[PDB]
Amino acid sequence: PDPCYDEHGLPRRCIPDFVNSAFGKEVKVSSTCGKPPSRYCVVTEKGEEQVRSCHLCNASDPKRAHPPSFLTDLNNPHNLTCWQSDSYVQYPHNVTLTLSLGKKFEVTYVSLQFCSPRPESMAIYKSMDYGKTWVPFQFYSTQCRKMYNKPSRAAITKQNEQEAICTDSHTDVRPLSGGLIAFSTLDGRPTAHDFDNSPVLQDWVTATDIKVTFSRLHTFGDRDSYFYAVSDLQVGGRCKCNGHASRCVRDRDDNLVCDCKHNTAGPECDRCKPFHYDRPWQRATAREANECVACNCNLHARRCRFNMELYKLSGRKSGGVCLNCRHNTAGRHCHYCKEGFYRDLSKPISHRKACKECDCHPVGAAGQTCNQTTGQCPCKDGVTGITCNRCAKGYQQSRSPIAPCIKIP
Amino acid sequence: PDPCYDEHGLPRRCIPDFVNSAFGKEVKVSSTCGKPPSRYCVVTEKGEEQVRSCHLCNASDPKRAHPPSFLTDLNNPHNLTCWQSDSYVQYPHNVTLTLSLGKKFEVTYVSLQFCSPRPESMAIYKSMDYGKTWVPFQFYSTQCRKMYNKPSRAAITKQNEQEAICTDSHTDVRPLSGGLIAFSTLDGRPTAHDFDNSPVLQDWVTATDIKVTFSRLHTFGDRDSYFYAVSDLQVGGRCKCNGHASRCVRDRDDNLVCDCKHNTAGPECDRCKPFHYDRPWQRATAREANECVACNCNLHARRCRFNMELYKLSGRKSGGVCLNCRHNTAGRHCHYCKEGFYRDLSKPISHRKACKECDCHPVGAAGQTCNQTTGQCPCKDGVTGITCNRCAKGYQQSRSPIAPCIKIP
Amino acid sequence: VRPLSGGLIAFSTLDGRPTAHDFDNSPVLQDWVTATDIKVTFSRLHTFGDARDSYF
Numbered sequence: 001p002d003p004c005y006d007e008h009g010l011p012r013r014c015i016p017d018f019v020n021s022a023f024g025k026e027v028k029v030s031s032t033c034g035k036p037p038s039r040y041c042v043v044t045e046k047g048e049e050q051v052r053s054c055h056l057c058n059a060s061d062p063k064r065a066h067p068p069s070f071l072t073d074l075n076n077p078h079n080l081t082c083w084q085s086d087s088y089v090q091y092p093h094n095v096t097l098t099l100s101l102g103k104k105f106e107v108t109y110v111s112l113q114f115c116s117p118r119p120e121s122m123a124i125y126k127s128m129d130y131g132k133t134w135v136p137f138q139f140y141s142t143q144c145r146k147m148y149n150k151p152s153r154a155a156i157t158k159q160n161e162q163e164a165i166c167t168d169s170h171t172d173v174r175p176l177s178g179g180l181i182a183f184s185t186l187d188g189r190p191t192a193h194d195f196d197n198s199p200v201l202q203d204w205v206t207a208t209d210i211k212v213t214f215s216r217l218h219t220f221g222d223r224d225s226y227f228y229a230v231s232d233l234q235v236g237g238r239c240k241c242n243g244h245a246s247r248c249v250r251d252r253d254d255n256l257v258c259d260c261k262h263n264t265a266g267p268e269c270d271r272c273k274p275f276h277y278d279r280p281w282q283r284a285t286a287r288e289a290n291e292c293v294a295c296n297c298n299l300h301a302r303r304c305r306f307n308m309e310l311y312k313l314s315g316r317k318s319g320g321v322c323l324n325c326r327h328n329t330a331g332r333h334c335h336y337c338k339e340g341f342y343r344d345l346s347k348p349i350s351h352r353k354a355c356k357e358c359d360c361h362p363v364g365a366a367g368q369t370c371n372q373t374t375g376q377c378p379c380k381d382g383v384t385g386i387t388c389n390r391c392a393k394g395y396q397q398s399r400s401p402i403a404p405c406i407k408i409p
Numbered sequence: 410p411d412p413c414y415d416e417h418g419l420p421r422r423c424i425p426d427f428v429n430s431a432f433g434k435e436v437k438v439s440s441t442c443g444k445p446p447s448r449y450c451v452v453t454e455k456g457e458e459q460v461r462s463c464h465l466c467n468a469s470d471p472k473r474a475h476p477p478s479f480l481t482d483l484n485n486p487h488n489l490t491c492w493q494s495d496s497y498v499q500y501p502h503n504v505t506l507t508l509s510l511g512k513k514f515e516v517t518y519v520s521l522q523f524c525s526p527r528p529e530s531m532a533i534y535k536s537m538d539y540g541k542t543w544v545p546f547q548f549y550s551t552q553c554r555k556m557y558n559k560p561s562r563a564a565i566t567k568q569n570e571q572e573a574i575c576t577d578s579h580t581d582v583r584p585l586s587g588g589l590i591a592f593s594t595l596d597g598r599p600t601a602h603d604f605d606n607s608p609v610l611q612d613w614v615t616a617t618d619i620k621v622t623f624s625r626l627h628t629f630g631d632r633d634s635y636f637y638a639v640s641d642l643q644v645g646g647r648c649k650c651n652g653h654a655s656r657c658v659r660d661r662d663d664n665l666v667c668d669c670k671h672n673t674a675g676p677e678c679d680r681c682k683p684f685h686y687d688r689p690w691q692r693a694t695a696r697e698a699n700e701c702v703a704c705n706c707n708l709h710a711r712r713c714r715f716n717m718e719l720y721k722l723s724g725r726k727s728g729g730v731c732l733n734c735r736h737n738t739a740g741r742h743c744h745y746c747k748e749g750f751y752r753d754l755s756k757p758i759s760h761r762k763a764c765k766e767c768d769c770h771p772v773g774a775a776g777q778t779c780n781q782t783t784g785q786c787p788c789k790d791g792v793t794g795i796t797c798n799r800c801a802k803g804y805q806q807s808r809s810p811i812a813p814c815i816k817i818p
Numbered sequence: 819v820r821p822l823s824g825g826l827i828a829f830s831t832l833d834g835r836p837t838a839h840d841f842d843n844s845p846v847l848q849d850w851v852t853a854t855d856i857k858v859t860f861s862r863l864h865t866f867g868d869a870r871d872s873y874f
């Protein structure tokens with residue numbers, strides 16, 4: 001059924017499977033060859049010396065077009081899809097590419113492959129918002145200082161495991177094409193071995209929007225028109241459901257969201273389902289599914305609230321409390337009968353009719369309300385019974401409209 | 410398409426077609442020739458006088474057998490299908506033949522076709538139940554008194570059109586064979602001209618199982634073996650669906666039932682369909698199909714109940730009422746938010762969340778029970794606002810977790 | 819209302835301005851007419867009486 005629940009349906013952490021994320025989507029870029037139709041020359045190294053070929057780029061030529069689909073189409077190791085930029089541009093200028101997401105994720109794999117040489121200076125960005133704010137992730141350059149004001153290959157301090165390092169690693173050529181960049185966000189991080197309890201890393205993995213800008217690329221000649229090019233992209237990940245959804249589905253307004261199980265809500269299972277507020281929302285752990293939990297109303301309310309001191313002083317047990325206790329019920333669990341009514345002790349603890357009116361004897365009973373727990377109306381001297389109507393043993397009814405029951409001498 | 414809806418899809422009375430009923434069925438009888446093999450003699454009149462032949466019956470002889478299928482089979486008026494009983498029998502004895510249908514029907518024509526002379530005394534029965542109770546319809550005899558204790562050619566009183574008449578009419582022979590039976594219950598009835606509004610006659614036509622017993626018969630000569638024989642049976646009718654099904658179909662357990670349209674239930678469309686408890690069940694009329702109608706919850710229940718006085722006091726309009734009137738809704742139409750909630754005015758009357766809570770400011774509002782009319786939360790002192798959150802003119806917010814807003818002199 | 823339908827509102831920015839007769843020399847007004855993007859927001863509408871109707 002649902003991997004969110006164990007053999008005996010015991011709630012267990014469920015995550016959408018590890019998949020590539022950026023496979024097949026559209027990307028808006030800063031520039032690309034072919035507008036106006038552009039040319040491009042291609043060098044190949046033969047043994048020890050050089051040989052320079054050359055071609056052209058019109059996007060209106062589909063086979064000579066290089067759309068962002070070339071970035072998102074499947075990379076056939078036998079039919080590559082090389083996109084190319086316009087030429088005659090370098091540092092200092094923003095070489096920016098765009099991405100429109102819509103579900104928050106945590107990522108493990110980011111794979112790349114080059115049709116151009118690997119430049120030297122580059123950096124990473126991210127946005128935990130929806131395209132408004134932007135923050136970096138790491139740097140890559142030989143001149144980490146003069147270009148990026150960065151130390152090269154810094155250490156990941158425990159006190160800031162969210163370090164943004166810079167290095168010249170894999171900023172070199174060869175490779176002139178098909179370059180491979182191996183980056184694991186988990187590298188160097190001291191608290192990576194237990195990520196489920198690494199919230200800074202659970203925040204270091206938090207990302208919604210992504211931005212990438214270039215400045216510097218290698219020069220070699222030393223006429224030519226220099227460019228940027230790439231055949232495809234791979235980035236693997238899992239849809240962020242906090243362990244509370246086994247997958248992610250579209251919304252009623254066409255929005256891919258987690259099918260948040262374990263009584264969780266929000267596109268990421270970030271919040272609990274409504275009326276699940278006895279203990280706060282938490283992320284499913286291997287030891288505990290840290291689920292949401294409702295308030296108890298004994299089948300007599302649909303709204304409830306909570307106080308931290310309640311759960312706090314509960315010895316960490318419970319803090320829910322219901323609102324608008326109907327069925328003449330009242331309490332944190334709507335668990336007692338109000339003024340005017342009493343508790344039908346015979347009836348179940350959560351029954352819809354557990355409360356009965358204090359039908360107190362307008363003569364034999366005095367108050368209008370009876371024992372809201374038992375139902376005992378004000379029984380007079382020899383009168384007994386819940387609502388106090390009858391005479392007791394040795395008590396005779398009299399036509400007196402005030403004292404009907406009289407003892408025996 | 411469906412005769413239950415007109416050219417403009419208007420729901421109209423749709424009816425099973427008029428067909429012969431006893432065509433091809435089987436009957437259990439009182440007795441029959443051939444066990445042991447029986448004999449019978451046949452006389453014929455020549456011009457003015459008689460001439461007598463004679464025959465025999467073996468049931469084990471297929472062509473000398475006379476099965477009851479001969480009454481129900483396609484009877485060729487030139488290759489007749491005569492069933493025969495054992496002989497040496499006459500009144501007084503129950504000469505009864507059986508028939509169980511299993512579904513209620515409406516019948517108009519009853520015809521017979523004889524291979525024997527027409528007797529004098531006979532009677533009718535029927536069963537408005539499944540073969541348990543039995544009531545007659547009319548009688549036929551010369552001595553309606555000596556045999557049936559009845560008058561011959563009785564009158565159809567208007568106050569009891571359920572009269573059972575007896576007459577000697579057409580009890581004559583000839584026909585000695587090939588008897589012609591044409592009986593219309595509607596003849597003589599002054600109120601037969603509009604059957605759609607004759608319920609006693611619509612009860613007079615009500616029949617489930619039928620019983621017929623025979624009696625007195627002619628002796629002419631006057632050695633003899635007397636018997637009875639008949640070539641076929643034809644009875645026309647339409648399947649009783651109260652005008653709420655255009656036909657009748659078999660069930661998953663081989664049971665011919667109406668495909669009850671018009672929101673009706675029962676094998677005969679006798680009652681409303683489940684949840685069709687807004688007004689009671691009725692029969693399709695020529696002016697109006699007097700259809701059933703479900704209860705309303707505005708998409709908030711699957712079960713409901715009904716009370717007539719609601720429809721009665723509605724000026725004859727409606728009486729349906731929810732069962733488990735869900736989705737924070739309430740009423741006979743699940744048509745209002747119960748105690749604690751109010752109307753999500755933005756949503757339609759049937760929205761799953763058409764009802765809105767009171768998310769009142771736990772500090773600035775005095776309770777979470779805002780008036781179900783306006784979303785106005787319980788603002789305490791000179792504080793105003795919908796959830797009672799902000800301060801008002803002359804009210805400065807304070808960090809006191811009791812009284813934020815305070816007047817100014 | 820009326821109009822309940824087909825209501826005709828013809829805002830003329832030119833109405834009422836005393837120096838509109840010489841707008842060709844009204845640069846602040848020549849800025850008041852400058853516009854690139856437009857936004858229109860509502861909150862309130864009339865009432866009557868007093869989901870029967872689905873007001874929209």
Ligand SMILES: *[C@@H]1O[C@H](CO)[C@@H](O[C@@H]2O[C@H](CO)[C@@H](O[C@@H]3O[C@H](CO[C@H]4O[C@H](CO)[C@@H](O)[C@H](O)[C@@H]4O)[C@@H](O)[C@H](O[C@H]4O[C@H](CO)[C@@H](O)[C@H](O)[C@@H]4O)[C@@H]3O)[C@H](O)[C@H]2NC(C)=O)[C@H](O)[C@H]1NC(C)=O
Binds near residue numbers: 037058059061
């Ligand atoms: C971007 O890169 C692509 C692919 O490399 C190039 O695509 C070219 O697209 C044009 C479309 O205009 C193609 O031109 C083709 O050749 C014709 C040559 O002229 C004759 O035209 C007609 C016959 O078509 C004759 O009657 C006439 O006498 C000429 O002899 C063009 O004229 C045609 O284009 C015609 O089509 C459009 C509608 O599509 C009409 O409105 C016009 O009448 C127009 O003339 C014909 O389609 C050409 O085949 C493509 N080249 C390729 C595929 O290599 C683009 O050229 C390039 N961008 C630029 C700016 O060059």
Ligand SMILES: *[C@@H]1O[C@H](CO)[C@@H](O[C@@H]2O[C@H](CO)[C@@H](O[C@@H]3O[C@H](CO[C@H]4O[C@H](CO)[C@@H](O)[C@H](O)[C@@H]4O)[C@@H](O)[C@H](O[C@H]4O[C@H](CO)[C@@H](O)[C@H](O)[C@@H]4O)[C@@H]3O)[C@H](O)[C@H]2NC(C)=O)[C@H](O)[C@H]1NC(C)=O
Binds near residue numbers: 446468469470471
């Ligand atoms: C009711 O009506 C039916 C239909 O008309 C009559 O049916 C008869 O059924 C019997 C059944 O046996 C038929 O008998 C048949 O004739 C044989 C005659 O015996 C001779 O057989 C050959 C010549 O045919 C000789 O060489 C031999 O030496 C005998 O002298 C019977 O012996 C047969 O009966 C055998 O058949 C049945 C299966 O059918 C077996 O189970 C037995 O072994 C049995 O011995 C043979 O079947 C006869 O033909 C039918 N008569 C008809 C059709 O007219 C009934 O007679 C009738 N009943 C009464 C009381 O009237």
Ligand SMILES: *[C@@H]1O[C@H](CO)[C@@H](O[C@@H]2O[C@H](CO)[C@@H](O)[C@H](O)[C@H]2NC(C)=O)[C@H](O)[C@H]1NC(C)=O
Binds near residue numbers: 094213
């Ligand atoms: C290059 O740098 C950044 C993007 O990498 C852009 O930032 C601009 O900063 C100025 C500073 O006042 C703002 O006024 C602009 O609105 C920013 N541009 C935005 C937000 O798009 C800068 O524009 C880039 N220059 C380019 C792309 O030519």
Ligand SMILES: *[C@@H]1O[C@H](CO)[C@@H](O[C@@H]2O[C@H](CO)[C@@H](O)[C@H](O)[C@H]2NC(C)=O)[C@H](O)[C@H]1NC(C)=O
Binds near residue numbers: 503505622
């Ligand atoms: C003739 O009339 C009816 C059937 O047409 C029979 O009525 C029987 O009445 C007795 C009364 O105690 C019942 O116990 C039997 O069960 C009835 N029999 C039925 C209903 O079949 C009556 O017996 C018939 N005469 C006969 C069979 O000789």
Ligand SMILES: *[C@@H]1O[C@H](CO)[C@@H](O)[C@H](O)[C@H]1NC(C)=O
Binds near residue numbers: 063078079
């Ligand atoms: C790769 O696919 C494109 C798609 O049109 C095709 O034109 C091209 O021939 C393919 N490559 C090879 C080597 O066949």
Ligand SMILES: *[C@@H]1O[C@H](CO)[C@@H](O)[C@H](O)[C@H]1NC(C)=O
Binds near residue numbers: 371373374375376
């Ligand atoms: C209700 O009945 C019990 C029975 O002994 C009694 O002790 C109590 O005082 C009554 N009133 C309450 C619980 O308010």
Ligand SMILES: *[C@@H]1O[C@H](CO)[C@@H](O)[C@H](O)[C@H]1NC(C)=O
Binds near residue numbers: 488
């Ligand atoms: C009448 O029908 C029976 C049924 O089988 C058949 O045997 C008989 O030959 C038919 N009669 C004629 C005259 O065809």
Ligand SMILES: *[C@@H]1O[C@H](CO)[C@@H](O)[C@H](O)[C@H]1NC(C)=O
Binds near residue numbers: 780781782783785
């Ligand atoms: C709720 O709002 C209505 C709307 O004006 C008002 O008349 C009423 O007094 C308020 N309080 C209630 C219904 O308790």
